[PDB]
């Protein structure tokens, strides 16, 4: 039920 | 300590969520992040994360901190089962060492 936050859009800033 | 996620959801619900992730996403780990009870620090609006297991704890801190309503200078500390993790560990490493029976990894953060 509770949605997941995935951090996918965030990984770009680790590169 | 009492994660609100555990009060809001039955064990069997949480275990089903965590177990599905582990079996379908070998590259990810299911993580709950909540403020530690005694903590004196800004708030995080979301608690349920699906986290690349190969992120370091330090990298996870960087991404999570962005999402906490913090003063710019505030540091925070993570606790997993009451221990501050190493920053060079990975989230997969922490998960293997520290995941709970519902197959979630629980991280409490604090101002300490």
How distant is the alpha carbon of residue A11 from its chain centre? 7
| Rounded Cα–Cα distance for residues B19 and A15 (Å) | 30
Q: Å from A10 to nearest chain B CA? A: 7
**Which domain range does residue B109 map to?**
1-112
Residue B11: count other Cβ atoms within 10 Å of its Cβ: 11
For residue B60, what are its two tokens?
Answer: 């996870």
For residue B34, what are its two tokens?
Answer: 């909540």
For residue B93, what are its two tokens?
Answer: 């490493």
For residue A9, what are its two tokens?
Answer: 């859009």
Q: Which alpha helices (H) appear in chain A, and where do they start and end?
A: none
Which of B5, B25, B44, B50 is the best residue to mutate to test the A interface, defined by the most A CB atoms within 10 Å of its own CB? Answer: B50
Taking the Cβ of residue A9 and every Cβ of chain B, the question of whether any pair is shorter than 8 Å is answered with: no
Interchain CB distance below 8 Å, B50 and A5: yes
| Rounded Cα–Cα distance for residues B85 and B99 (Å) | 13
For A2, left (φ over 0), alpha (ψ -120 to 50), or beta? beta
Q: Å from B112 to nearest chain A CA? A: 25
Cβ atoms of residues B50 and B33 within 8 Å: no
Name the 3-class secondary structure at B57.
Answer: helix
In chain B, the number of structural domains is: 1
Question: How do B105-110 and B28-35 pair as beta strands?
Answer: parallel
């Amino acid at each position: 039920a509770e949605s997941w936050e995935t951090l996918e859009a965030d990984l770009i800033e680790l590169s | 300590m009492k994660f609100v996620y555990k009060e809001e959801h039955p064990f069997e619900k949480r275990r089903s969520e965590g177990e599905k992730i582990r079996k379908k996403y070998p590259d990810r780990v299911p993580v709950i992040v909540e403020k530690a009870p005694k903590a004196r620090i800004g708030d995080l609006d979301k608690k349920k994360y699906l986290v690349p297991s190969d992120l370091t704890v330090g990298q996870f801190y960087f991404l999570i901190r962005k999402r906490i309503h913090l003063r710019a200078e505030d540091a925070l500390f993570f606790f997993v089962n009451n221990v501050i993790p190493p920053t060079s560990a990975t989230m997969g490493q922490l998960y293997q060492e520290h995941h709970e029976e519902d197959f979630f990894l629980y991280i409490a953060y604090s101002d300490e």
